Amino acid sequence: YDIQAWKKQCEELLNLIFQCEDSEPFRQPVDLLEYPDYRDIIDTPMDFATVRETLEAGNYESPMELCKDVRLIFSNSKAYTPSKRSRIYSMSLRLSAFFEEHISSVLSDYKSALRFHKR
Ligand SMILES: O=C(c1cn[nH]c1)N1CCCC1
């Protein structure tokens, strides 16, 4: 019932993501010189270094806020891809499945800790 445990769990999950080869296109903001039309399609850029920095700054209040920003990395890739068979989009789908499989227990444990506190 540790209300704060999600933070270290998210740091460790980000470490696993940074080791995945599939995260390489998403570690840093998209290079707007290589993709000059990026901001014509994407309203809010997001990347894993920004997520990690926001977490380490103490600027997430819950793992649900972190999960919203990670999910934005994946929805941006889906919106930007010129094809559902593109290399970088395919990497995003695998990485999203890995993220979702690992974040589920983090969210469940956090919500359980809040409920126990309210009890
Ligand atoms: O999400 C994409 C992308 C998706 N399909 N093709 C490119 N990018 C983020 C990193 C740079 C490109």
UniProtKB/Swiss-Prot annotation:
It is linked to Chung-Jansen syndrome: An autosomal dominant disorder characterized by developmental delay, intellectual disability, autistic features, anxiety, hypotonia, obesity, and dysmorphic features. This is PH-interacting protein. Residues 1-106 form the Bromo domain. The modification Phosphothreonine is found at T44. Expressed in myeloma and epidermoid carcinoma cell lines. The modification Phosphoserine is found at S90. It is found in: Nucleus. Probable regulator of the insulin and insulin-like growth factor signaling pathways. Stimulates cell proliferation through regulation of cyclin transcription and has an anti-apoptotic activity through AKT1 phosphorylation and activation. Plays a role in the regulation of cell morphology and cytoskeletal organization. The chain holds residues 1316 to 1434 of 1821 of the full protein. Interacts with IRS1 and IRS2. Interacts (via bromo domain) with acetylated lysine residues on histone H1.4, histone H3 and H4 (in vitro). Signal peptide: none annotated.
